[PDB]
Symmetry: C4
Subunit: 497 residues, 4 copies
Amino acid sequence: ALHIAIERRNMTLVTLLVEGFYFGELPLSLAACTNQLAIVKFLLQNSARDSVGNTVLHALVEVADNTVDNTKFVTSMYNEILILGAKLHPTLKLEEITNRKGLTPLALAASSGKIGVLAYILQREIHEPECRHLSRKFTEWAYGPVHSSLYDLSCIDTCEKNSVLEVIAYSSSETPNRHDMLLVEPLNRLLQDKWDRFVKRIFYFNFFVYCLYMIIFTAAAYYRPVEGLPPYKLKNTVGDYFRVTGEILSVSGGVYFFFRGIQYFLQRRPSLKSLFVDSYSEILFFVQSLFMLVSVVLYFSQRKEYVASMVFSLAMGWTNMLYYTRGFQQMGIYAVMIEKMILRDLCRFMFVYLVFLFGFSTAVVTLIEDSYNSLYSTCLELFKFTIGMGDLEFTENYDFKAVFIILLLAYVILTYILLLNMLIALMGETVNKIAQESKNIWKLQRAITILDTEKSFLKCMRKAFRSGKLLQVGFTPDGKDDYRWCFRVDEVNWTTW
Amino acid sequence: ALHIAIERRNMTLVTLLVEGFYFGELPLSLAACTNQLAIVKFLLQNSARDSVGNTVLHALVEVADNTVDNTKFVTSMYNEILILGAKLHPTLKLEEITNRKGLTPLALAASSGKIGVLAYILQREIHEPECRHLSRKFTEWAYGPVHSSLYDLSCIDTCEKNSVLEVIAYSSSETPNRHDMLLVEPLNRLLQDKWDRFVKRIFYFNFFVYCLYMIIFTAAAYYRPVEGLPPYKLKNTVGDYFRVTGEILSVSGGVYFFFRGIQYFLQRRPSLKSLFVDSYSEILFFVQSLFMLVSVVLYFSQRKEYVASMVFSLAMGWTNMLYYTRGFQQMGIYAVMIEKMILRDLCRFMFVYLVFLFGFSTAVVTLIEDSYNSLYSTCLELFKFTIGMGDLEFTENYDFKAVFIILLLAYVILTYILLLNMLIALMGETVNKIAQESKNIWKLQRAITILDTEKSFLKCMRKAFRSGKLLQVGFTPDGKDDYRWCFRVDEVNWTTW
Amino acid sequence: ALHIAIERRNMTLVTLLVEGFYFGELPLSLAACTNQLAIVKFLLQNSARDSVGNTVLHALVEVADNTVDNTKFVTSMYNEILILGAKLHPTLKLEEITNRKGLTPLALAASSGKIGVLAYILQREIHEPECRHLSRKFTEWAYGPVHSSLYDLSCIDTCEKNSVLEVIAYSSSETPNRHDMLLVEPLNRLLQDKWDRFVKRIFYFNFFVYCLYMIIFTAAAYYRPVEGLPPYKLKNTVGDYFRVTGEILSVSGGVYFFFRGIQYFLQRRPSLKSLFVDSYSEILFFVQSLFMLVSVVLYFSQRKEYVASMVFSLAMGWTNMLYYTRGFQQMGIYAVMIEKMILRDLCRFMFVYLVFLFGFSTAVVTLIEDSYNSLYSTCLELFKFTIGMGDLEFTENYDFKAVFIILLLAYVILTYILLLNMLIALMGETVNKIAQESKNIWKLQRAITILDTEKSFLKCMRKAFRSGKLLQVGFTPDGKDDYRWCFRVDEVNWTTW
Amino acid sequence: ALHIAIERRNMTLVTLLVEGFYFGELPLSLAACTNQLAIVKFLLQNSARDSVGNTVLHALVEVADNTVDNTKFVTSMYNEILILGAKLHPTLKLEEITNRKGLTPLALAASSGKIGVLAYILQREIHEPECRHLSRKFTEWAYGPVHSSLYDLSCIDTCEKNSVLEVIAYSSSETPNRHDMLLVEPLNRLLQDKWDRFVKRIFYFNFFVYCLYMIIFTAAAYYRPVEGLPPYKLKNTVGDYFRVTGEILSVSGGVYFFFRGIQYFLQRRPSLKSLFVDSYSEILFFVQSLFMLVSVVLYFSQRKEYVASMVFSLAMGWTNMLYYTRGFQQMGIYAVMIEKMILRDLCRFMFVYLVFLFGFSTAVVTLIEDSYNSLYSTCLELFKFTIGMGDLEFTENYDFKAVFIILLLAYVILTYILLLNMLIALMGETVNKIAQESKNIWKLQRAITILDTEKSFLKCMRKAFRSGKLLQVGFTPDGKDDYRWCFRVDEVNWTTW
Ligand SMILES: COc1cc(CNC(=O)CCCC/C=C/C(C)C)ccc1O
Ligand SMILES: COc1cc(CNC(=O)CCCC/C=C/C(C)C)ccc1O
């Protein structure tokens, strides 16, 4: 009755009565979510939590499609509902109420990834002195066409459970707007300010330390003993001393990266199904650590097979230096494109190319009578065509010339001239598509680095720098108390006047 | 008189009289096809089949150009004519009348490929209780802005001769909209539902069985006897037993694919002129079967030349595994692009490159005096330049150094640096063009697989699943009887309200 | 006075008086060219040739900028002036008057390349019976929305000196619209009709004959005598007879192409500055003929150096078969792109690459002490890097390892990885730009082939086919005589009604 | 009070009182910069230099954002202020006042790079005889729709300290519009006129002289003595005489380029941080000179290591010939693209590729036991994969086959197939982006060449040609004196009428 009549958008029906689409589980949520501006007014004058913990604000954000009209009336109705909550209940902070997951409506908007409501809440301001405390953005002053704005940033830096910026950064990448979500003024300028302030220096110190670690590890690997099986007994030579110091430093760094990989996985707890896409760099750093530890295990197991794992660790550590080039803007896009291919284009192309290579490998191997008769050897001899180093007659031990050479021509036309250039065209398309995208994936993960660095910060460095500035605000009618950690930012728009 | 006056769009002329462009062969067809809304009303109040079997509805669809205004008034006039048929003759189902080809007007629209009238008929609904049975789309209910729609789907799943979806899928690809024709709501959701329901499992079972067949066939080919001429006498060794089992299984699969190719060609009966373009995969599977059967023939003919055909079958079977990757969405586009090149770009480029290669091959061969003097050998030595493995002096047995080396430089500049990169640029253009196209060619052939799988389904599996759901409809004035196999689908549009 | 006042666009000034921009050299030309609709009326009521032979129509076409407003009022004023010429002088055919160059105003519009006035004159029609003969386009009839139009085509097929289509086709390519100029209805359909009618068959007969000539010439070249110096004495063997027949046929074709090149150059007389751009194919065919004749000269000069020229002719003849692939639509674009590169991109890239190659060649040669010390040999060894067949240590006879290997690395980075891929990117840009352009350059030169084929046609084949159809037209008031060679074409536009 | 009230845009506040954003440091600058059209009128009726030397005009240009509305009202208010300066003070030339840097407001606009105000001042004209001298553009006459305009060009050719064109050309490339800034009519036509007039001939003479110098230097290098250590004693042979002449000419050119590099660096004094980006060609010419001088030093130091530096100079001189190809239009874009890559794409890709190459080099070297064991040798053997000349088994001296070959496959997939094609895609994107940009970077540096050539011109050639023409102008009310070096240019716009 109430549900059907309210959903009918009939004011008369609601006035007469009261006197799988998810829209909340209470009448207020239905009325608000259905664009009923006046019906909610009557229902209030004729902050509830539903069975899922979602209040009317949660039902508002849950329904928004992020489109222009959706964002328009959703923001408007959010404002009206929050005002009537203000006038009827000034002291109540309806936003503080959280669902089962524990997110506030702003945090819910960030989690789901709707930039409309997010930007509205971020830039919100209410002139009316009826509820002056209820404004997110405070305008400091204007001298000419200049405007020095302030933004509240209550839970954007460090909240009770999850801050807004944390949720944006640690999104599983299924959230659509994620990169664009950082473009909004307060978050963007806050990120750049934190980066320039102190996190830049720590990041370069980390980068230099990692370079130093990799250089000493490369030296210690290069000059490994070649006599006998390990472990090789310590010698009194200065070279021996430097070498044992290099090995112990390298394995210390290895276990360090191992523990950091574990603790990252525990903190984030990402889905194993989407482990690669969200976190590519961490997997590689962890696997480098794992190769180092496996190498140490095989080393003290009295096996010569330790150099196999150690060499993989050495190569992968150098090829993991790109992670630091995401600290810059110019190089970070470049590395992001390598991540995108190795995740998307290169696995595709490898499965297809392996179908082709294996088909023609088995074909030529069965054709050859019989030394290139090991299916491995023929696979290599057919792979050497892709690198432009193969030859049309690697063998002469076939009964049939026409069949063999036809097989090789068909393979070369299929892979060297056709598949490989399909990959060239596809990576051209990828660069064309993501020339704009990578510019903000870079920012997104630059934000992840900032959050990781500040999280791994002790009391002294964290107390020495907190975001924004603690500034008093408009006193509330309940107790004349409103002081917040508000950030400050400038702006000059001529049309503002 | 009637024809000329009616075509003049003069209501007065028709009222006075009655009282190579194909527009139907009766006055009603001319009046309807010429946008004469009122003239047809008088002609009715002042369902015929013409000499070609085309009724007024057939003349309507035949005339539509599928453009915005054409579709607009064609759909409108179709509605008006069908309503007047309803009021004057409620019991008559004018659409059931078919032309000589046997297609209904909806089937005719699908065959010709006009998405305008097709989408109109697919989404048609008539509120008026004057003829309530005459609505294609039935709205189940609406709780809020939710709308649970139902679509009739009379002949879209299994009709008397040809269903709508069958005609869309088995189109010769000359029909323009074919891919877009599957995007329309009922067909699209019906396809995805059928795929997810049961056809997905059968397709993966088929894919795994094909992989198993190819692996056992690869093993049986690899370990073929190398002693003497065939047939090789059975041995009591376990290896001999496994090998004979592998050979008999491989040839059984070969004859299976042979028969399936034949029966496909009989069912579809495609034009030999356009055999490749419409059906690329079937040709390859059939030719693999043909190579296997030729190999068996040469095997029991006591010839050593069986391995030639068997090896071609083995290679082509592996390279035909891409057909299954059209079952996925990510990989199917990739395989479709290979089909597109081998049909369009690669034949072009091969004819041109063969002109160039043969010209410079004959040039260098006539220049050489004389061992590279076989026109085959020089062709290979000039082909090795394309793969980046050739050399500017493969021979020294020429009287003229300048002429020979000039020929080679001109060839390399013409083919390696210029033609081959024209192919690179062309495939870049192809990917740029069809990045959107392949996304729906994939769907189109995914639909072909679904239809093929359901067609090759016995009574039990077909009766266990029929599309849509049998639900009663608005009773007709003739006998109060309207029950259809109507599909159900949800939708949420805010502007609908 | 008259000039300044008329150019002032003051009707009062002209009425009072009469009672380096090229705008014609008479008052009427100034008034018409300056948008003075009424002033010309008074000047006529208050067909001259100027010192350059340009009438008012010539001054009209000379001034048009081909833009939307320019074409609009130019076409309008052309119509008004031509009508007033009609009423004041019905018998006069003002268009027949020609300038010094001999072009009529329509021919002048075609020569200068303004598609606006050209399309207007091509599609012109005048309903008014005041001058019914003065309409270019005659509407045959309309049955429904069908319209069977007729176009006059007086001088479009075969005029006194230069036909319209001839001027469009033989344009020096500086004319901007040239390709688009053939898209206009009468010319386009006339071209396609002539092609399908008889010229298609002659073109394929020519193509097959050329293939036959090249095959017999390839055979005669391949089996040349290798003993002694020429001329080689005739032998009674059947092989000798076939070989002398092949040689005489080949040289006959060579002299044939030589004479055709000469007569083409005399007929067209193109500028030597722009000889390549306008006529690429003719230069190559002529040079093949020239190589054959030089080979015959050296052959009968008792020199073994005839095979050098003959081999160049043999290679270039095969590589000239692309000219026939411009007869098709699919392959013609492909060949046109090769023409475009060899004219534009490849000369650019060769000059730059030769600067680089010569710089590093001389560098490495001076570095080497000393066998790779011939500047030719080092140039080849550095060219072999581009084809992916070079090696970083081709020699060891250098005093300095670091300098030599640095030179080679710098060269490889500069040419193999950077210049060569600049060429790849540039040809990608070229294909991207001209994917649409080539589609109509093909048509343009397909038109050139049609004109060449019909020009080289005797009385019988020309009288057996003349374009259009001789049909009587609206009788003129002067003598009631108007019969023209009018072409016929259909059209169906719904908005026409 | 005055500042705040004026910035409030309240005319009443200013009338009542009077009776880090940079907007000038005086009330007039604030009123003008804030769009207060009327307030400045009162302030004048109720040419100051501020502490930074910026007058109201400087404050106007400093504030413009170059956007459509910004340029609109900035140009309008500039006109109004300059007129009121005219009426109140006709004799005063407010523009002549300069800031501390010495730039006039036009020069300031050019320096900052705002094309709006620049184009306005360049094309300015004032019809009103109230101040007729105050018009930049003078219209010579109009015969029909023709208009022969004149532009003043006071300080555009040769001013007191810095001309307008000089500032545009010598911009540090941080100025955004720089290329577009030369497109404006007077500057563009003035550049092309100067180029065609005399600078073209001098540039070709310089190009031919440089080619001659490089050829004689190449010859003198090629035939260097190979016996003993330098200096090689003079011989009486004619070859010895030509060789000493070649060496002395080559070193004379070397010192010439050295001095020109020094004097360029002194005149321009560009920032060492952005030395490459603004001036790529000069660095290369200077470094060629430096290599030649180092070679002479090592030559007279009795060392055989002179050929190392001389060979680098020889190679780099040839590869520096591209600088002259920026004199043409077709080739200049081509060379500019090489500059852009070697500055932007190639350093990026080299740092990443060096990370990868070094990682896998150290990996394979530590894996190898041990001749390819020098880390240099393995780096070369892994670089040879990029050029398509490497091989998967260059060595067999490894204990582990799987690990080694896995390392090589991973490297080849990472660099040859993935990184190198990321570079191909990136350079494709670069060409796509700058196909339009390079067309005007070419013009920009062609302007730099013109300015350099005229600057290095004596009294005779400079007095023989000065830009524009000295023509009298509208006499000023102060002393009836206005004569300027005004340039002349034609134009034909139909809409002008
Ligand atoms: C089987 O269906 C498909 C297959 C493919 C890829 N496979 C091919 O293109 C086969 C080409 C022929 C290669 C045979 C070589 C022999 C002579 C050694 C793409 C799309 C499909 O639908
Ligand atoms: C000189 O002005 C220009 C030159 C170029 C091309 N030249 C280069 O890029 C030189 C690169 C350095 C190559 C030197 C190799 C030595 C070490 C053997 C383009 C644009 C210009 O304006």
